[PDB]
């Protein structure tokens, strides 16, 4: 069960980090607007 917990923690941390640094990656600049 601890192996499963380690794997799930790794997966959740990976996706959360992707989310966090994706909105850190100049997200207000990714739009088709003028400005």
């Amino acid at each position: 069960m601890l192996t499963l917990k380690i794997f799930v923690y790794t997966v959740v941390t990976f996706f959360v980090g992707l989310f966090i640094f994706g909105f850190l990656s100049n997200d207000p600049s990714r739009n088709p607007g003028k400005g």
Partner: protein, 44 residues
Amino acid sequence: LVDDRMNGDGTGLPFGVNDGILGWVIAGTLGTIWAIYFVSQKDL
């Protein structure tokens, strides 16, 4: 006892970390993503 359990429900474990390897894999995964984002930073 008749079987083994992690016995982690309750007890106020930080981030539910009952074994320090969990904190290490959290830190490692976050740091790897951060390092990728940081070396690929002046980029869009």
